[PDB]
Design a protein around this ligand. Structure first.
Ligand SMILES: */C=C\C(=O)NCCNC(=O)CCNC(=O)[C@@H](O)C(C)(C)COP(*)(=O)O
Ligand SMILES: */C=C\C(=O)NCCNC(=O)CCNC(=O)[C@@H](O)C(C)(C)COP(*)(=O)O
Lengths: 75, 407, 405, 76
C-alpha cells in the first residue's frame, strides 16, 4: 500500500496546507499561495522523495498538482 | 529640548527563562542556566558546557516566516512577540507605520547554516541540496530582516554588529532614532544561535572555560580566583524603545527612562580590553545624570584577563563610592550578541521588582577584586538608577544607564 | 544643527583599485566582470563575477592581517586611501574620542566560518582551527579589524543590512555628526568574494547564468533579457566630517550629505514593494531645495527588481525625472560594499562633472520607457545627486549629496 | 652535506616576524620578541606542522623560551 499519491503529501508539507486542499488540478501559485522561492524548495522536496533528478527547465512549467504526478510516473 | 526615550515593553528567551517571569524567578534564586553539552564534546572541543535555551521552538512560528530563519532570528522573533504583548501594542498601533522601526542583530550571523550550505554544495547534489533559504539565514542582518518583514515594520530596519556588545549598541542606536525625532517606537534587541560551529572558534582562542565540565553550573564564575574563561550561550531579547510623550499619552507601562548611552573604542588591543576605553564609555553614559548609580550589571565574562580590567575601570570612574555590582553571566553564560539586551532586561527586572541578583560561584574572591561591593547573595533594595556594560572584540564598548520615571 | 561633508574617499573595486582608476573606468563604461574558475569548479550555474584585481600580499602589517578576512582587507586598504585623500595625519585622527568608525559587511566571512568547521572536523581537530577565525568570521569583523590598528577611540561598530549595508553605515555616520557626538567618522564596508557565499545566492536563482561565455554582458540592468545580478567583491571608505571642522583645517570637500533615507517594506522578504522605496527617496529629499540632477539607481539587473525601482522613481519625480544610470551593469553587485562604492561613484561624477553610462542595454525594457536612462558617457555640471541601496528583508537606504557653496 | 639542525628558530622567526638574529635561545616569546597569548597558540601549531608531532596542552605552555621549544622537540 503506497501508491504514488504522496506527491500530494510532499506538496502538502512544503506548502503547509491541508491534504484535502491538494487536488490534482490545483495550481501552486494561484491556489496554494506558493511563491518564487517556495517553487524551488518543492522541486527539491520532490527529489528527496523519489530518488530522481529533475532538470531546470524540466522542473519549471510543472506548476499545478497535475504535472508533478505526471512527471514522476516513468521516472 | 531634546526627545526622551523609555522602555515600555520587553521579551526574552534565555538559558534561565523563556519569558520575563521565569527569568525573574531564576534571577532571585541565583539559578544557573548552564548544562553539559554532548554536541560540544562530540565536536572535539575542550569546553563541554552550555548556556542553552530550554525550549522546543518547532511550530512556534508560521511556516512562511520561519523558513527564512536561523536560531538567532527565532529567539529574537519570540522575544519580540513577548515585547509587543507586554507593551500593550496592537497590530494597528505598530504595523505599516513609518515612525515604527527595528534595530536588532547577532554577533556572528549563522555559522551553522553557512556550513550547511557549503556541505550541501560539496555533496553529491551540489546546488540542488543547498535550497533557497541559506542567504537569509546566514547573512549578518538576518535577525533584523527576518523580523521586520513578518511584523510589517515600516520605519528604520537594520542590524548593528559589535561582537559581544551587539544588542547594547542596538538599543543605543534605537535611542538615537528617537532623539533625532525620526521614530516614535523602535524595537531593539538581538539573538544568537548556539552551536559547535561557532563555539569551537572561541575554544581555539582559549576563551572558553574547560576545567569545570564535570560541574557545569560552577563553570561560569566571574571574579573567582580560579576562573578560566566564559561559558558560551544562546538566546534572544527585545525591548520596546519609545518616545516619552508617545508612551505616557497612550497610557503605556514604563519600566525606565534611558538617561545614558555610551559608545567608544579602545584602538589598542584586538582581543584584550584597555582600561581607558571603558572609563570613557561609563563616564559618557553618566553625563547629565544627577542621581547616583545604585546597581551595575558588569560585563564580567569570567575570563582571567577580562574581569579585573573592568573592575579597574569601574574603580577609576566611581573611586570610593562604587555602586553594587553583580555579574549575571555567572548564571546565564555568555550570550555574545544577545548579551547586551538580555542583561539590560535583567537590570530592568531588578529595577522593577526592587532587588539585586547575586554574582554567584565566587568561592575565592580575586586579589584584584577587593573592596568593591560585589554582591553575592540576593538582596532586596529599592533601586532608582542602574548601569549595564557590554564590551566586544576589536575593543568596542557600550554602556547603558536606565532610571525610573518620576511621579 | 550640524552638517556633514565628505572630505576624503578610498575604494577597491572591480573597476579600479583607487579613485583615479575608477574615475577612468566610469568614463569608459568599462566592465569589471570576468570569468571565474572558482565559481565553476564549485558547481554553480553562474560563472561570472566582479572580482578585485590586486595583489594584497604585504600591503598590510602582519600583526594586523592575521585577524582579517578579505572583506576587512578591502575595507582597510580603502581606509588607508581615504585618510591620505583627506590629508589626515595620525595626530589628527588616532587616540581621538571625537573620531570614530562605522563599517560592516553583508555576510561577514563564510569562507572562514567554513574553514573553521572543516578544520574542526578534519584531523588535529581544534588544533587546525587557529585563534583567528572568530575575528575573521564575526559580523563586526570589518569594524573591529580596522578600529584597532587605526587607533580609533570614537564610535566603533558595524551596520548590517544586506545589500544596503554600507549605505546605512554612511547614514549613521551622518547622524553621529548631527548629534554632535563625532567630528569625523570613517564610514564604509567590504565584502569577500568566494563560492561559499556566492553559491547560496545562486541557489536562490538570483544570479546571472545565461551569459557565461560573454562575462561583460552578463550584468545588464534595464535590458529586456536580464537574468539576475553578477556577484562582486571589494571595499570602500569615505571620511564623513562635521562642516566647521573641515573648513577650519582647509580640507577638500567633495560634497555635503544633505539627505539620508532609511525605511522598511514590511511586506515581502526578497521582493521590493515600491511603497518603501518611495518613502525612502522622499525622506532623503526633504528640505533639499535644489533638484536631483543624477541618480545612481540600485538596479541589479534582476528581472523582478529593476522595474520596481523605476516605478518608484516615477512616483517620486513624476514628469521631472533625473538622469539615471545603473553602474552595477559595469561593476556587478558588491553586496555589503555596494552602498559606499556607489556613493563614491556618484561623488566622482559630481566632482568631475559627468554621468557614467548604464551599459549593456541592448533592448530597453518596455516598462522602462518614459525615462532619462543614460547609455552614453555625458559631460554636465551636476549639483545634486542621489544613490539608492536596497536589501533583502525589505530594507532601504538613499543618500543625497550636493556641492557646497 | 649536512641536513639542517633545528630550524625551530626559523619557525619562531617567521611566526613572530623577526630578523633571525634576534631569535636568541634564551629569548622568551612574551618579554622579548613581542608575542601575545594569541601569537603563542599559532606558534605551537606551526611547530606541529613542522616536526610532524602533536603537543598536548599541558606541555605547550611550559614552552615559552626558544630553548624550551628545542628541548621539547628533541626526545619526541
Ligand atoms: C542582496 C540582494 C539585493 O540587492 N536586494 C535588493 C534589490 N532587489 C532585487 O534585486 C530583487 C530580488 N531578487 C529576486 O526576487 C529574484 O532574483 C529571486 C531572489 C531569484 C527570486 O525569484 P522570484 O520569482 O521572486
Ligand atoms: C566576546 C568576547 C567578550 O566578551 N569581550 C569583552 C570582554 N573581553 C574579555 O573578557 C577578554 C577575553 N579574552 C581572553 O580571555 C583571552 O583568551 C584572549 C585575550 C583571547 C587571549 O588572551 P592573551 O593572554 O593575550
Amino acid at each position: 500500500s503506497t501508491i504514488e499519491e504522496r506527491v500530494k503529501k510532499i506538496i502538502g508539507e512544503q506548502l503547509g496546507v491541508k491534504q484535502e486542499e491538494v487536488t490534482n488540478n490545483a495550481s501552486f501559485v494561484e491556489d496554494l499561495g506558493a511563491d518564487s522561492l517556495d517553487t524551488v524548495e518543492l522541486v527539491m522536496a520532490l527529489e528527496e522523495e523519489f530518488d530522481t533528478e529533475i532538470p531546470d527547465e524540466e522542473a519549471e512549467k510543472i506548476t499545478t498538482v497535475q504535472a508533478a504526478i505526471d512527471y514522476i510516473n516513468g521516472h | 529640548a531634546m526627545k526622551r526615550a523609555v522602555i515600555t515593553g520587553l521579551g526574552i528567551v534565555s538559558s534561565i527563562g523563556n519569558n520575563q517571569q521565569e527569568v525573574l524567578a531564576s534571577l532571585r534564586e541565583g539559578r544557573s542556566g548552564i548544562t553539559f553539552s554532548q554536541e560540544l564534546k562530540d565536536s572535539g572541543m575542550r569546553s563541554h558546557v552550555w548556556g542553552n535555551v530550554k525550549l522546543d521552538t518547532t511550530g512556534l512560528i508560521d511556516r512562511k516566516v520561519v523558513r527564512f530563519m536561523s536560531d538567532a532570528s527565532i529567539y529574537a522573533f519570540l522575544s519580540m512577540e513577548q515585547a509587543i504583548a507586554d507593551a500593550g501594542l496592537s497590530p494597528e498601533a505598530y504595523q505599516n507605520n513609518p515612525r515604527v522601526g527595528l534595530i536588532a542583530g547577532s554577533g556572528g550571523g549563522s555559522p551553522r547554516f553557512q556550513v550547511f550550505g557549503a556541505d550541501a554544495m560539496r555533496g553529491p547534489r551540489g546546488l540542488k541540496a543547498v535550497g533557497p533559504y541559506v542567504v537569509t539565514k546566514a547573512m549578518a542582518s538576518g535577525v533584523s530582516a527576518c523580523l521586520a518583514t513578518p511584523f510589517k515594520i515600516h520605519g528604520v530596519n537594520y542590524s548593528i554588529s559589535s561582537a559581544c556588545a551587539t544588542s547594547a549598541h542596538c538599543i543605543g542606536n534605537a535611542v538615537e532614532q528617537i532623539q533625532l525625532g525620526k521614530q516614535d517606537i523602535v524595537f531593539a534587541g538581538g539573538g544568537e544561535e548556539l552551536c559547535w560551529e561557532m563555539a569551537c572558534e572561541f575554544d581555539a582562542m582559549g576563551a572558553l572555560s574547560t576545567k569545570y565540565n564535570d560541574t557545569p553550573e560552577k563553570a561560569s564564575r566571574t571574579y573567582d580566583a580560579h576562573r578560566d574563561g566564559f561559558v558560551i550561550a544562546g538566546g534572544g531579547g527585545m525591548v520596546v524603545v519609545e518616545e516619552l510623550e508617545h508612551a505616557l499619552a497612550r497610557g503605556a507601562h514604563i519600566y525606565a527612562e534611558i538617561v545614558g548611552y555610551g559608545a567608544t573604542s579602545d584602538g589598542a588591543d584586538m582581543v584584550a580590553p584597555s582600561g581607558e576605553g571603558a572609563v570613557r564609555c561609563m563616564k559618557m553614559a553618566m553625563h547629565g545624570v544627577d542621581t547616583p548609580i545604585d546597581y551595575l550589571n558588569s560585563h564580567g565574562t569570567s575570563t582571567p584577563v577580562g574581569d579585573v580590567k573592568e573592575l579597574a575601570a569601574i574603580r577609576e570612574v566611581f573611586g570610593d563610592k562604587s555602586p553594587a555590582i553583580s555579574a549575571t553571566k555567572a548564571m546565564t553564560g555568555h550570550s555574545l550578541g544577545a548579551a547586551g539586551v538580555q542583561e539590560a532586561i535583567y537590570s530592568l527586572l531588578m529595577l522593577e521588582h526592587g532587588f539585586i541578583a547575586p554574582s554567584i560561584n565566587i568561592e575565592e574572591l580575586d586579589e584584584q577584586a577587593a573592596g568593591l561591593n560585589i554582591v553575592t547573595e540576593t538582596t532586596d533594595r529599592e533601586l532608582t538608577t542602574v548601569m549595564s556594560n557590554s564590551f566586544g572584540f576589536g575593543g568596542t564598548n557600550a554602556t547603558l544607564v536606565m532610571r525610573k520615571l518620576k511621579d
